[PDB]
Amino acid sequence: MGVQVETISPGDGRTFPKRGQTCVVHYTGMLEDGKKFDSSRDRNKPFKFMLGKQEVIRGWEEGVAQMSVGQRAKLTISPDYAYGATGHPGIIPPHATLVFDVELLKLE
C-alpha cells in the first residue's frame, strides 16, 4: 500500500503544500506496535523540509501534500513508501509499517 491519511484535528482546509515550499511540522514516529522511534516534540524544535526534494520518505512527500496548514493528521505508511526491505539498523526493522502523528504548523 501507500500512505493513508487520517485526520486528527482540522487545518484551514484551504492552504495545501506545493512543490518547493518548506513544510514546518511537529511529528512523532512509531513502529506498528506503537513504539516511538523519533519525535520532534521531544526535542522541542519543529522539523523543516522542502516538498519535492526527497529529504523525507515518500509517504511524507505524498501524505503531507494532502494536509492543510494547521492540520494534525495520522499517516500510516507501508514499507515501500518508507524504509523498505532494508529498514534502518537499530531503529527501524525490515518491512516496517510506520505511523506518524504530524502537525503542519506553517509553510515557508
Query: Catalytic residue positions?
Result: 27, 37-38, 57, 83, 100
Amino acid identity at 28: T
Amino acid identity at 55: E
Spell out where the chain has E strands: 3-9, 22-31, 36-39, 47-50, 72-77, 98-107
CA 38, CA 94: separation in Å to the nearest integer?
17
Contacts of 90 (CB under 8 A, 6+ apart): none
